[PDB]
């Protein structure tokens, strides 16, 4: 019958369900409360991520209407972005086939972000 014999340890009322949970129940001990040193380390992570995200090397994801009004005048431009080809590249560190997308002989400025000792994170 294939559904009659049981091992010695098991009982008849314990089998027949097969409810295997999908959610884990064994946590690592890393889930404790945060400390001051860990909070400074975390805000260092956050500041570094913000610095890289707004830096010249981002390569983002893969209402500017055509009508012209008088309000288009006296309107500020958003932000003059530093592009990929506006960095002082050391050309010895790159293959030759990537030269044409860089700036070989154009204006170069090195964008520097100053570290903020104060915690930008609000609580």
């Amino acid at each position: 019958n294939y559904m009659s014999n049981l091992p010695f340890g098991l009982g008849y009322g314990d089998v027949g369900k097969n409810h295997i949970t999908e959610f884990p129940s064994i946590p690592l001990p890393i889930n404790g409360p945060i400390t001051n040193k860990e909070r400074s380390l975390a805000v260092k992570y956050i500041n570094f991520g913000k610095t890289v995200k707004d830096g010249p090397f981002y390569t983002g994801s893969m209402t500017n209407d055509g009508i012209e009004r008088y309000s288009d005048k006296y309107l500020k431009k958003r932000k003059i972005g530093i592009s990929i080809d506006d960095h002082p590249y050391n050309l010895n560190l790159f293959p030759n086939e990537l030269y044409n997308v860089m700036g070989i002989n154009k204006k170069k400025l090195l964008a520097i972000s100053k570290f903020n000792n104060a915690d930008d994170v609000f609580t």
Partner: protein, 145 residues
């Protein structure tokens, strides 16, 4: 269904009204055409109008919206009275001033007669134009070509 370009051209309300009146005359949808053939007499010819109800409804709503008077004042819109050469001469009068394409489009659509409405359509009206030019443009627009 692919949109090659979202905005190909700008249509004045006069162009839309003229095109839809021509469409209603072609498809026998005007009030005169439906009252003459389909009403007050038998349809011996059986010259049925265009069957399409949705297009008829939307074109009737647009022709009624553009046919009733523009609300420059509290019974005709004026665009229903204009012609091609009148449109051309009025618009060429409008290029002579310091107006943009959108501002000229709104002027042609609504035909402002109120002073404050003409203030509302064009931005920085007092700074860009002195009182003489605003009076002249109000007289030109209110004159209906």
């Amino acid at each position: 269904m692919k949109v090659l370009e979202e905005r190909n051209a700008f249509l004045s309300d006069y162009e839309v009204l003229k095109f839809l009146t021509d469409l209603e005359k072609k498809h026998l949808w005007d009030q005169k055409s439906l009252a003459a053939l389909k009403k007050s007499r038998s349809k011996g010819k059986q010259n049925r109008p265009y069957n399409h109800p949705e297009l008829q409804g939307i074109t009737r709503n647009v022709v009624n919206y553009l046919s009733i008077n523009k609300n420059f004042i509290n019974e005709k819109s004026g665009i229903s009275k204009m012609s091609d050469e009148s449109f051309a001469e009025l618009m060429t009068k409008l290029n002579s001033f310091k107006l943009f394409k959108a501002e000229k489009l709104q002027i042609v659509n609504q035909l402002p007669a109120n002073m404050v409405h003409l203030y509302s359509i064009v931005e920085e009206c007092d700074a860009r134009f002195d009182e003489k030019t605003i009076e002249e443009m109000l007289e030109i627009i209110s004159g209906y070509a």
